[PDB]
Amino acid sequence: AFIILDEVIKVTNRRVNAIEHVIIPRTENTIAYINSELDELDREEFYRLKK
Amino acid sequence: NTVSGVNGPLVILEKVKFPRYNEIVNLTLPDGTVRQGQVLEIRGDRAIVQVFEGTSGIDVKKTTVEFTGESLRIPVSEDMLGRIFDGSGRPIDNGPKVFAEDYLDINGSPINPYARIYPEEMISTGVSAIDTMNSIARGQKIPIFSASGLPHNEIAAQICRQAGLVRPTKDVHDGHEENFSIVFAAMGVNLETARFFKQDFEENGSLERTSLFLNLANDPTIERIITPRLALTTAEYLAYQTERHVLTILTDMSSYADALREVSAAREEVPGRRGYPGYMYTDLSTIYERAGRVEGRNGSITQIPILTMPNDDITHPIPDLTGYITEGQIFVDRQLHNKGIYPPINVLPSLSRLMKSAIGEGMTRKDHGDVSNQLYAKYAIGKDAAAMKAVVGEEALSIEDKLSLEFLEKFEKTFITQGAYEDRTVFESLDQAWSLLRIYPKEMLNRISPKILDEFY
Amino acid sequence: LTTAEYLAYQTERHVLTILTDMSSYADALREVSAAREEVPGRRGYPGYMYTDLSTIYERAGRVEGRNGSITQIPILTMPNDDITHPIPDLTGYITEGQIFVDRQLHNKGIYPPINVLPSLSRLMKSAIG
Amino acid sequence: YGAIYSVSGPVVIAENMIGCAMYELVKVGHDNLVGEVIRIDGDKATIQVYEETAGLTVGDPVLRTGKPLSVELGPGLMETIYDGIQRPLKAIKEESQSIYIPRGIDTPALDRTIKWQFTPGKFQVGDHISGGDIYGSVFENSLISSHKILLPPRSRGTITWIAPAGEYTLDEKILEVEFDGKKSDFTLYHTWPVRVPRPVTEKLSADYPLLTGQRVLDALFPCVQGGTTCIPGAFGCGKTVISQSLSKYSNSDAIIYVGCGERGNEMAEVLMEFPELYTEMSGTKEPIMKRTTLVANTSNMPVAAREASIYTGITLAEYFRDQGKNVSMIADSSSRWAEALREISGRLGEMPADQGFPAYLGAKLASFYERAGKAVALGSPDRTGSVSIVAAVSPAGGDFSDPVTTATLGITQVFWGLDKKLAQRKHFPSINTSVSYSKYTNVLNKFYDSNYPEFPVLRDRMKEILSNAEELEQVVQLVGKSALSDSDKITLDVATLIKEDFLQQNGYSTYDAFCPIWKTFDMMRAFISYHDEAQKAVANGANWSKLADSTGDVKHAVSSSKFFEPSRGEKEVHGEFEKLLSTMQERFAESTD
Amino acid sequence: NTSNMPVAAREASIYTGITLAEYFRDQGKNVSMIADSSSRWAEALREISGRLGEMPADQGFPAYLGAKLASFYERAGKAVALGSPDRTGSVSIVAAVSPAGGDFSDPVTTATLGITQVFWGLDKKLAQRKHFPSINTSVSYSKYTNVLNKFYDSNYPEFP
Amino acid sequence: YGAIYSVSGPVVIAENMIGCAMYELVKVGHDNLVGEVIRIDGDKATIQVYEETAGLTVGDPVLRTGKPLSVELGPGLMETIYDGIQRPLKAIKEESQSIYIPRGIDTPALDRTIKWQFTPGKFQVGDHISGGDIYGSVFENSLISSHKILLPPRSRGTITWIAPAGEYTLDEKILEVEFDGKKSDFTLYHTWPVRVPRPVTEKLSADYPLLTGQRVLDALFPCVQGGTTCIPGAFGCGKTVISQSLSKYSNSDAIIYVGCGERGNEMAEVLMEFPELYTEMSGTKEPIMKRTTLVANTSNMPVAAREASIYTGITLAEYFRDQGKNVSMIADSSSRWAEALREISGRLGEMPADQGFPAYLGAKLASFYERAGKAVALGSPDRTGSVSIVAAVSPAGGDFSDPVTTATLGITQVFWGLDKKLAQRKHFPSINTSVSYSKYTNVLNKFYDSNYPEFPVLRDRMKEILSNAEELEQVVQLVGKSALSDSDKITLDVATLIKEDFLQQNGYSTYDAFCPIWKTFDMMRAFISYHDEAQKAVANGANWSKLADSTGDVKHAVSSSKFFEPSRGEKEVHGEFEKLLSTMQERFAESTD
Amino acid sequence: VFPTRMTLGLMKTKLKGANQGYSLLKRKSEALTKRFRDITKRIDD
């Protein structure tokens, strides 16, 4: 069992790093950048109607 | 005539139609104080002025207008170094007066004579990461991209002070034969900042070296936009008339851009992407066009603008625009700063596309450019490997990757780590750089030409 | 389309009319009305963009008394590569299903490179012969 | 004539206009600045004045020229440098002692100082002539006559007077035309409004090789003669760099460079570099420049010059095509042209679309590209020409969805990429296959197969390799290199090698040397060969380590091959590439058993 | 009404339908108002907003949208018939709603969820695998549950 | 004087307004509501009226006050609760039976019931006196420096009448000044418009700290007067605590508290608590409140008062700086001042910039920071005083990536990161060494080294030790603590004492949250001597378990360090630390050998 | 690069997914390391 545990721990240590370092900042950058562009289209329209 | 109304930085004058565009007018307050402005828009029997100074207290028939009948030009003299001036076309510091031998326009074409021949002379900062990886030339434009957790002022001053000691060592080498002049202009920064800068220049050398334009944050946005224009007139005269190389340090460039943003918000002018003007391209251009070698071809204006990024993003309009226009990019990193690296310059995205113009070969090595490309390439691989070291562990990474992780660590801690007054010659930097390359084997250094690798290792 | 109505109804033709490219039509709508009283809708694309569309869809369909038909296959190019953008979005509500292409197959080299997961026709069971 | 009513920003309103055409050229004020009539509101015409205004008074004079903003097409366009408002830049330096345009200069469209040698055509007296016909020719270069003197389109008649062989100046008459008496005299130059495209006989299919001379294009997605291209990217993208290479190597008989609002130092570099460097089909005195004309404009230089750049340049191109030349037009960047419009929409107070850029953007780009293509020249002799447009654009912060890039991509049929990550390691320009396509790829391979190379067969495997490489790389990142199979390791290595040896044009001694379709083909034979033999080898049992260390020398050789000058046995097949093929064969065998 | 008819008609369509439902409710008849789709009706108000030269403040949809979407919906319900004879009538409105801003957090969908009491879901991705209606438990709620379930207990089902 | 043309919302326009300035204080209607003219179009002045314009018909009169809206600076500031444009809330409680000020109720900025004792200066009639020179003083405090009366800035002349010693009212004249006939009379206060910065002899950089009396502020990254600082928000479950404690523990001469636009729970807490708490330096007469002057606005107060709030506070701070005093401006929060700008913009019709916040935002912040700082006070014998701004910036988008936060941090040179999890558990303050920085470090550390502490050595070392501890903690999780050396274990052991004693301080006890700047230095001395000695001793042959038993008594003392009194003979040298040093050296021979 | 309309719906659920998944993977690692220490001691015996 002991040899079997050693083989599994390595797959498991890899995953804990993988999520934090890659995934979480990829989600952050995508969401915020699209949020910012999306609000811009809406704001300029108001200014053009007003003008 | 008399003020009709005032809506923000815009002033509505009811007048008569004789005024010309950007003709100076002086507003006489009931206090008997005069403040200056220039007409931004003229129409029949009326004007819109933007006043440089102030933006409130402006009356109606108790106030009066008087015309100067000269559109704004800056009084330029060549005896400007050592002399204290204020960013308003005159000192309001009570510093030594400007004088005039020419008055030159800030529109962006007075008599403008620039590059039909690109920079070929190397100018060093004494800092390896700048000089080796990107290079600086007698017309080069390089933006310092900085942050709200980096100390922008300390790096700004660092680059300038160390480039003054190196630059006469380069004069002796015959990279130069003409004077060096500094033009330092601070526009709309804190008092704390302003004081600091002056103190820094004194320690290294003197303040006789530099000319100072000081503009205070409490003074308007309209003042702030004229502040670099004043710097440009100073530099163009020195290069043109007296064949001097002029170095301009323009802080803060972001300060200037926010100002533009304010005169479209309190104007009826519709702004472009992210609330920054549509005609933002032209405003920025004016500063950057007035660069390169100046006629006679011993004079020059070289630019180092200083940008502080507020969000620290590379999707913000200011860093993006600046980058397309400028001949290089120097990115300064918060993570290096934290770790204990000074200067804490990350070269991962620092790039020049006008890399050839930037390097020298008649007062620097020919090998300088060849080594730099290889270094950058090997740094980048070393970063790809760093992310992979966190994920995968050392439990599958390859023999080749291991060399690249070592290189990355040796590279930060030796090359980019320099004393506060320690200046490195460009030739000595090569020797340092060669130490960095030397741990990789002759099959990993395969991309480089065989001739260079067998010659210098 | 007026020409298609002549053939379909008077001389009993089955007309297949191909109308390319709807993106160029849509763009035109935006540029006009920047100097009329009428003033564009969502993201600078007309709010009455829908009315324009509907005039094209008007002359399409089965014809009374069953003399001929006009069948129409419009070609739309997604300019941002999203169907949440105005050109696919308004058009899609009028239309009886949609067939959306696939970016990924193309790269592989496939032709015709469409995919079936975003493609659905609702009136499928009842329509067919 | 007219009198300035108002100046509000660069926008000027002047009363007492009874007329004026669209985009009519005017000289405004005593200063004589550039303008165009955009609109008319009442009697007051709003004219934008696009040369910097810091001192124009109200009630200054307004002079109509009486025709739109136009270009001269005539002799001495080659080895002569101009602005986007067709002012010769050289003429300005001498007179003005202002190397760039200063505020308030009025210098005529061409050089009326340089006499040119005129010889008469196959059209003598009493013969009918019609627009775009070769009425004569002018010696401009050491090797060829550049400027074929055309009767202009929208003119016709029989020639009463043909000037004889000799030297004349530009304003002197040299042609007299009969049709309703003296229709007029003609001079050496002819005029045309640049908002009207020039008419062709017919447009012809695009399927003929365009050799741009750069390995990276030839390998992945070549262009065609008749092509349209979009290229994105943002500083460190190598766009200036690929222009210089492009001009040197280009098989086209004219190259027209368009600077849309450039650094100035960038313009100063390319100008110097064309006479410093030598051409590949030979060139006697200012070698490359003999084929190069510059339209150059800087970032603050007139907004009219910048806006007109693409139209001034496309009109030039159409005229060379009507002459019977193959033209490669490089515009850099259309995005800087797009900023000129963003600015125009604000000033006027017209309502714009998204990102504060107007909606008319989409039409204006499209009009420019459609006048490009391969055609049969207008005029009686009949020739074949092309205008192949390579148009640079820039993303807004890594956002490729910005209106300018999306619009250009709408119209283009070829897309070539630019990847930021790959430029940082120095591989610019950086073209993959998931950011790029070419519709011409299919016909183009059929034409290259014919000429000699095996290219179509190798192109398919090459595409696949890159496409798999990306996907396989994502697994290395997340899972690690422990989930791979051995064949997938192979795909990773061959790929890294391709990245460096084509895409990188960065030096290590010398910027890389002319690589043709033939050279490019040899590289592809060696990479593709490496991959097949190695996978066989691992499949059939063998060490990874044994195979990679063994290829070794061969890898160093392909890297550096491009620095070495072409022909090393032949252009066709080099001895240096020929020999590797044997080495792989010898290795494959050692490995297997 | 099809899209091809006048937008003036498409604007009116829903009103004609509810007045017919309401007359019948007053007759003492039980009526089903089945409407498909309100977002197209909302798109009709938007077509008119740009043509009249109004000021939208809801992503290019009129400011007036919220008062018209709500006012119309309140006409459905179970009620005691108008008049002296005394009868019972009802109008049940089963309404489809759809995106129109392209989001799901666009004004159209915001106004409709607030005014409604019953929502049963549908997901597009699961629907493609063919399992429509492919109800989302999380977006679904019913206010009616308690009284309706009490009724069903009387009717025989142990349902609740 | 003027007549009302329109009332459209709280915005009222009036015609027949001439010589109307652009900051002009005006009183609208018969009711006399406060308003100020933002804009002027023609004959018509556009006024924002801060109070309800209900009952105001068109045709009501508009009476100019004849001067901008100003704030009064003089005797009787301290121990008063005020509006954002300085109106005593306390005085409304007496009259109205209201906490707040309801519409149609205005009162003067300073109370005229209160009389103060005016003492002449060193100038007498016939002396020339200059801008800011000390004309007299008022004494009404004994715990702190009082209100020294200056001649109004930008005002010069010869004094016709200097009132002699005696009690005068604030309203009443005590000076007439001869400067071109009678210049005017002046009173005990001076009026100054608050959207104009007050002059000083010259401004300097900061260099000079003072008692903060919260250990974590000094220890982790020093707190300076004349500083610029950002503190995170929490909306009164964390924000309130740090603010109350900074006011109470800091024995700065004055403190000016500004609530820009708060919940109203926080405003309610600061007023009741200030007389209730005890000074940390001794004295009664409403301890902390006597040192405090409060501007307290909840979000419910008019929007112009919320916008004005910081400006009035900053003028107040600047006035005391010319007297020569050290001031803490504690402002909470700028996000709430910013919210006002957004509101005021939409009412005018102004077009903002990003996230709905105007473009006046970035320049108004830059202008604001510079008014605050260190300066040599104006007045003839000269003193030094400071104005230190600590401004909280809270969530304004639910993140700290919004325009208000991102703009400020940049001008700011200091960030102190409150920790939420520790804050929810009620340790205040609990500053995180990871996020935090001070760019003031260098100049200051040199200042304390001068004064007597070993401060540079200890502060730098404090930071390194903690940073290092996170990195060693990871090696314990993944490899194990047992395979690691004694030296590493020690690095962590010491970091835990530095964390426990300084960082986890409880502002609900004064023997655990009040200690002088020297006292805080002595504790930190104690921990560093132990770290070095512990690493030295384990190397010479000791173990973690052995070391722990052996240090014993000194380790226990350092753990118990915070519980000790602010004095032991002096509050500057704590005798128990100086002797502790000996017991440590004696212990180290024993332990090691 | 990516849609400018309603990337927020798919991206929002990813982000939550990630932090939620991370927390959970940490508990599974903690359990695996928990048992591992124990068996290492038992195996030497």
mmCIF file with all atom_site columns, N, CA and C in Angstrom, chain F residues 456-488:
data_model
loop_
_atom_site.group_PDB
_atom_site.id
_atom_site.type_symbol
_atom_site.label_atom_id
_atom_site.label_alt_id
_atom_site.label_comp_id
_atom_site.label_asym_id
_atom_site.label_entity_id
_atom_site.label_seq_id
_atom_site.pdbx_PDB_ins_code
_atom_site.Cartn_x
_atom_site.Cartn_y
_atom_site.Cartn_z
_atom_site.occupancy
_atom_site.B_iso_or_equiv
_atom_site.pdbx_formal_charge
_atom_site.auth_seq_id
_atom_site.auth_comp_id
_atom_site.auth_asym_id
_atom_site.auth_atom_id
_atom_site.pdbx_PDB_model_num
ATOM 1  N N  . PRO F 1 456 ? 17.407 51.697 12.560 1.00 0.00 ? 456 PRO F N  1
ATOM 2  C CA . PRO F 1 456 ? 17.661 51.057 11.236 1.00 0.00 ? 456 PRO F CA 1
ATOM 3  C C  . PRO F 1 456 ? 17.940 49.619 11.313 1.00 0.00 ? 456 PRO F C  1
ATOM 4  N N  . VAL F 1 457 ? 18.748 49.071 12.219 1.00 0.00 ? 457 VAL F N  1
ATOM 5  C CA . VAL F 1 457 ? 19.185 47.720 12.360 1.00 0.00 ? 457 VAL F CA 1
ATOM 6  C C  . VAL F 1 457 ? 18.019 46.804 12.696 1.00 0.00 ? 457 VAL F C  1
ATOM 7  N N  . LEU F 1 458 ? 17.209 47.297 13.641 1.00 0.00 ? 458 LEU F N  1
ATOM 8  C CA . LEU F 1 458 ? 16.179 46.470 14.182 1.00 0.00 ? 458 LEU F CA 1
ATOM 9  C C  . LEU F 1 458 ? 15.058 46.376 13.171 1.00 0.00 ? 458 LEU F C  1
ATOM 10 N N  . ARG F 1 459 ? 14.608 47.505 12.409 1.00 0.00 ? 459 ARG F N  1
ATOM 11 C CA . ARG F 1 459 ? 13.393 47.571 11.580 1.00 0.00 ? 459 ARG F CA 1
ATOM 12 C C  . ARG F 1 459 ? 13.598 46.760 10.417 1.00 0.00 ? 459 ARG F C  1
ATOM 13 N N  . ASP F 1 460 ? 14.812 46.884 9.800  1.00 0.00 ? 460 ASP F N  1
ATOM 14 C CA . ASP F 1 460 ? 15.093 46.182 8.554  1.00 0.00 ? 460 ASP F CA 1
ATOM 15 C C  . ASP F 1 460 ? 15.009 44.703 8.833  1.00 0.00 ? 460 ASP F C  1
ATOM 16 N N  . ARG F 1 461 ? 15.678 44.244 9.931  1.00 0.00 ? 461 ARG F N  1
ATOM 17 C CA . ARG F 1 461 ? 15.787 42.905 10.370 1.00 0.00 ? 461 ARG F CA 1
ATOM 18 C C  . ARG F 1 461 ? 14.467 42.295 10.719 1.00 0.00 ? 461 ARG F C  1
ATOM 19 N N  . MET F 1 462 ? 13.501 43.138 11.272 1.00 0.00 ? 462 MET F N  1
ATOM 20 C CA . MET F 1 462 ? 12.179 42.744 11.562 1.00 0.00 ? 462 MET F CA 1
ATOM 21 C C  . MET F 1 462 ? 11.480 42.242 10.335 1.00 0.00 ? 462 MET F C  1
ATOM 22 N N  . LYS F 1 463 ? 11.659 42.977 9.242  1.00 0.00 ? 463 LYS F N  1
ATOM 23 C CA . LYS F 1 463 ? 10.960 42.643 7.977  1.00 0.00 ? 463 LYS F CA 1
ATOM 24 C C  . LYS F 1 463 ? 11.454 41.356 7.376  1.00 0.00 ? 463 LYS F C  1
ATOM 25 N N  . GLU F 1 464 ? 12.811 41.237 7.303  1.00 0.00 ? 464 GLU F N  1
ATOM 26 C CA . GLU F 1 464 ? 13.477 40.067 6.696  1.00 0.00 ? 464 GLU F CA 1
ATOM 27 C C  . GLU F 1 464 ? 13.168 38.783 7.332  1.00 0.00 ? 464 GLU F C  1
ATOM 28 N N  . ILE F 1 465 ? 13.162 38.802 8.692  1.00 0.00 ? 465 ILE F N  1
ATOM 29 C CA . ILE F 1 465 ? 12.826 37.655 9.488  1.00 0.00 ? 465 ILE F CA 1
ATOM 30 C C  . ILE F 1 465 ? 11.479 37.029 9.228  1.00 0.00 ? 465 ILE F C  1
ATOM 31 N N  . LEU F 1 466 ? 10.391 37.894 9.079  1.00 0.00 ? 466 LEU F N  1
ATOM 32 C CA . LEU F 1 466 ? 9.070  37.512 8.805  1.00 0.00 ? 466 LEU F CA 1
ATOM 33 C C  . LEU F 1 466 ? 8.896  37.015 7.432  1.00 0.00 ? 466 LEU F C  1
ATOM 34 N N  . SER F 1 467 ? 9.591  37.646 6.398  1.00 0.00 ? 467 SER F N  1
ATOM 35 C CA . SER F 1 467 ? 9.453  37.256 4.983  1.00 0.00 ? 467 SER F CA 1
ATOM 36 C C  . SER F 1 467 ? 9.954  35.924 4.753  1.00 0.00 ? 467 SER F C  1
ATOM 37 N N  . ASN F 1 468 ? 11.107 35.636 5.390  1.00 0.00 ? 468 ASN F N  1
ATOM 38 C CA . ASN F 1 468 ? 11.875 34.435 5.429  1.00 0.00 ? 468 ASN F CA 1
ATOM 39 C C  . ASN F 1 468 ? 11.122 33.229 6.028  1.00 0.00 ? 468 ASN F C  1
ATOM 40 N N  . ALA F 1 469 ? 10.295 33.561 7.071  1.00 0.00 ? 469 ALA F N  1
ATOM 41 C CA . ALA F 1 469 ? 9.463  32.623 7.805  1.00 0.00 ? 469 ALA F CA 1
ATOM 42 C C  . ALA F 1 469 ? 8.358  31.984 6.915  1.00 0.00 ? 469 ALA F C  1
ATOM 43 N N  . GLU F 1 470 ? 7.730  32.726 5.982  1.00 0.00 ? 470 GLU F N  1
ATOM 44 C CA . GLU F 1 470 ? 6.776  32.154 5.094  1.00 0.00 ? 470 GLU F CA 1
ATOM 45 C C  . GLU F 1 470 ? 7.404  31.136 4.228  1.00 0.00 ? 470 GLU F C  1
ATOM 46 N N  . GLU F 1 471 ? 8.604  31.447 3.710  1.00 0.00 ? 471 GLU F N  1
ATOM 47 C CA . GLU F 1 471 ? 9.351  30.537 2.838  1.00 0.00 ? 471 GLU F CA 1
ATOM 48 C C  . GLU F 1 471 ? 9.840  29.247 3.541  1.00 0.00 ? 471 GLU F C  1
ATOM 49 N N  . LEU F 1 472 ? 10.310 29.293 4.781  1.00 0.00 ? 472 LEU F N  1
ATOM 50 C CA . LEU F 1 472 ? 10.656 28.148 5.576  1.00 0.00 ? 472 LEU F CA 1
ATOM 51 C C  . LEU F 1 472 ? 9.526  27.294 6.029  1.00 0.00 ? 472 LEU F C  1
ATOM 52 N N  . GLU F 1 473 ? 8.310  27.877 6.243  1.00 0.00 ? 473 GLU F N  1
ATOM 53 C CA . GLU F 1 473 ? 7.050  27.228 6.642  1.00 0.00 ? 473 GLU F CA 1
ATOM 54 C C  . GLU F 1 473 ? 6.622  26.277 5.549  1.00 0.00 ? 473 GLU F C  1
ATOM 55 N N  . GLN F 1 474 ? 6.821  26.590 4.292  1.00 0.00 ? 474 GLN F N  1
ATOM 56 C CA . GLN F 1 474 ? 6.444  25.744 3.202  1.00 0.00 ? 474 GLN F CA 1
ATOM 57 C C  . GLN F 1 474 ? 7.250  24.458 3.189  1.00 0.00 ? 474 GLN F C  1
ATOM 58 N N  . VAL F 1 475 ? 8.532  24.479 3.569  1.00 0.00 ? 475 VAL F N  1
ATOM 59 C CA . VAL F 1 475 ? 9.491  23.363 3.611  1.00 0.00 ? 475 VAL F CA 1
ATOM 60 C C  . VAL F 1 475 ? 9.029  22.418 4.716  1.00 0.00 ? 475 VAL F C  1
ATOM 61 N N  . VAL F 1 476 ? 8.475  22.963 5.856  1.00 0.00 ? 476 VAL F N  1
ATOM 62 C CA . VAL F 1 476 ? 7.842  22.145 6.905  1.00 0.00 ? 476 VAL F CA 1
ATOM 63 C C  . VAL F 1 476 ? 6.613  21.375 6.498  1.00 0.00 ? 476 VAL F C  1
ATOM 64 N N  . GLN F 1 477 ? 5.730  21.925 5.645  1.00 0.00 ? 477 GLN F N  1
ATOM 65 C CA . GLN F 1 477 ? 4.523  21.277 5.156  1.00 0.00 ? 477 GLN F CA 1
ATOM 66 C C  . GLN F 1 477 ? 4.885  20.155 4.284  1.00 0.00 ? 477 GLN F C  1
ATOM 67 N N  . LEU F 1 478 ? 5.732  20.357 3.212  1.00 0.00 ? 478 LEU F N  1
ATOM 68 C CA . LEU F 1 478 ? 6.002  19.413 2.245  1.00 0.00 ? 478 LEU F CA 1
ATOM 69 C C  . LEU F 1 478 ? 7.114  18.473 2.648  1.00 0.00 ? 478 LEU F C  1
ATOM 70 N N  . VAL F 1 479 ? 8.298  18.866 3.124  1.00 0.00 ? 479 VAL F N  1
ATOM 71 C CA . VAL F 1 479 ? 9.294  17.896 3.479  1.00 0.00 ? 479 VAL F CA 1
ATOM 72 C C  . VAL F 1 479 ? 9.179  17.356 4.884  1.00 0.00 ? 479 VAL F C  1
ATOM 73 N N  . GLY F 1 480 ? 9.062  18.272 5.896  1.00 0.00 ? 480 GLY F N  1
ATOM 74 C CA . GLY F 1 480 ? 8.962  17.913 7.274  1.00 0.00 ? 480 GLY F CA 1
ATOM 75 C C  . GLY F 1 480 ? 9.941  18.794 8.067  1.00 0.00 ? 480 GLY F C  1
ATOM 76 N N  . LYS F 1 481 ? 9.666  19.092 9.351  1.00 0.00 ? 481 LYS F N  1
ATOM 77 C CA . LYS F 1 481 ? 10.402 20.044 10.153 1.00 0.00 ? 481 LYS F CA 1
ATOM 78 C C  . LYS F 1 481 ? 11.647 19.347 10.779 1.00 0.00 ? 481 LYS F C  1
ATOM 79 N N  . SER F 1 482 ? 11.630 17.936 10.728 1.00 0.00 ? 482 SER F N  1
ATOM 80 C CA . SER F 1 482 ? 12.568 17.134 11.416 1.00 0.00 ? 482 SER F CA 1
ATOM 81 C C  . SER F 1 482 ? 13.786 16.969 10.710 1.00 0.00 ? 482 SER F C  1
ATOM 82 N N  . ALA F 1 483 ? 13.768 17.044 9.362  1.00 0.00 ? 483 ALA F N  1
ATOM 83 C CA . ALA F 1 483 ? 14.899 16.963 8.526  1.00 0.00 ? 483 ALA F CA 1
ATOM 84 C C  . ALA F 1 483 ? 15.631 18.312 8.386  1.00 0.00 ? 483 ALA F C  1
ATOM 85 N N  . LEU F 1 484 ? 15.060 19.376 8.986  1.00 0.00 ? 484 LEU F N  1
ATOM 86 C CA . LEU F 1 484 ? 15.627 20.688 8.870  1.00 0.00 ? 484 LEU F CA 1
ATOM 87 C C  . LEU F 1 484 ? 16.293 20.976 10.116 1.00 0.00 ? 484 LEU F C  1
ATOM 88 N N  . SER F 1 485 ? 17.399 21.783 9.933  1.00 0.00 ? 485 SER F N  1
ATOM 89 C CA . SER F 1 485 ? 18.314 22.242 10.907 1.00 0.00 ? 485 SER F CA 1
ATOM 90 C C  . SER F 1 485 ? 17.661 23.039 11.965 1.00 0.00 ? 485 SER F C  1
ATOM 91 N N  . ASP F 1 486 ? 18.342 23.200 13.068 1.00 0.00 ? 486 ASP F N  1
ATOM 92 C CA . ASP F 1 486 ? 17.990 23.925 14.300 1.00 0.00 ? 486 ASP F CA 1
ATOM 93 C C  . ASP F 1 486 ? 17.869 25.427 14.067 1.00 0.00 ? 486 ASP F C  1
ATOM 94 N N  . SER F 1 487 ? 18.705 25.915 13.149 1.00 0.00 ? 487 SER F N  1
ATOM 95 C CA . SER F 1 487 ? 18.821 27.308 12.725 1.00 0.00 ? 487 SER F CA 1
ATOM 96 C C  . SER F 1 487 ? 17.539 27.849 12.104 1.00 0.00 ? 487 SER F C  1
ATOM 97 N N  . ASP F 1 488 ? 16.926 26.965 11.168 1.00 0.00 ? 488 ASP F N  1
ATOM 98 C CA . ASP F 1 488 ? 15.709 27.279 10.503 1.00 0.00 ? 488 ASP F CA 1
ATOM 99 C C  . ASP F 1 488 ? 14.534 27.309 11.386 1.00 0.00 ? 488 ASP F C  1
#
